[PDB]
Amino acid sequence: KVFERCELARTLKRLGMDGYRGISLANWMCLAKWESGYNTRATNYNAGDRSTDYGIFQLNSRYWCNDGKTPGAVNACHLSCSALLQDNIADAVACAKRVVRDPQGIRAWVAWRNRCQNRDVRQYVQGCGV
């Protein structure tokens, strides 16, 4: 599913992401935008290390979910990577929450540092009623 901006903003808020571990809703929106374009079926294979990024938050199979073909993988979210490809993003959200519970927080995603950190991210939630 390819979410529309405000549709996603309202969904994330209802799932308790606003201010989760100190991360504002606009930051989560900026992250989803640059990672997948708000697309839940997005997948990206990393030929260099044999891992794959799954879903709207592009969660990596080496640490967050199990796809069975990634070497030295752990499954911290205890989910099959298939769960991160559903239209319902509840599982993807529960896993993103786990990621930020680690020391790096939102910085775990390099895309956030390049495209969101220290920027005016207000635009991502403007007019969505959240």
From Swiss-Prot:
Cellular location(s): Secreted
Disulphides: 6-128, 30-116, 65-81, 77-95
Enzyme class per UniProt: hydrolase
GO BP terms: antimicrobial humoral response; defense response to bacterium; defense response to Gram-negative bacterium; defense response to Gram-positive bacterium; inflammatory response; killing of cells of another organism
Classification via InterPro entries: Glyco_hydro_22 (IPR001916), Glyco_hydro_22_CS (IPR019799), Glyco_hydro_22_lys (IPR000974), Lysozyme-like_dom_sf (IPR023346)
Record: active site: 35, 53
Catalytic activity: Hydrolysis of (1->4)-beta-linkages between N-acetylmuramic acid and N-acetyl-D-glucosamine residues in a peptidoglycan and between N-acetyl-D-glucosamine residues in chitodextrins
Miscellaneous section: Lysozyme C is capable of both hydrolysis and transglycosylation; it also shows a slight esterase activity. It acts rapidly on both peptide-substituted and unsubstituted peptidoglycan, and slowly on chitin oligosaccharides.
Involvement in disease: Amyloidosis, hereditary systemic 5: A form of hereditary systemic amyloidosis, a disorder characterized by amyloid deposition in multiple tissues resulting in a wide clinical spectrum. AMYLD5 primarily affects the viscera, and the predominant clinical features are renal dysfunction of varying severity, and intra-abdominal bleeding. Inheritance is autosomal dominant.
Family listed: Belongs to the glycosyl hydrolase 22 family.
Function: Lysozymes have primarily a bacteriolytic function; those in tissues and body fluids are associated with the monocyte-macrophage system and enhance the activity of immunoagents.
Subunit structure: Monomer.
Protein name: Lysozyme C
Organism: Homo sapiens
Organism lineage string: Eukaryota, Metazoa, Chordata, Craniata, Vertebrata
Gene: LYZ
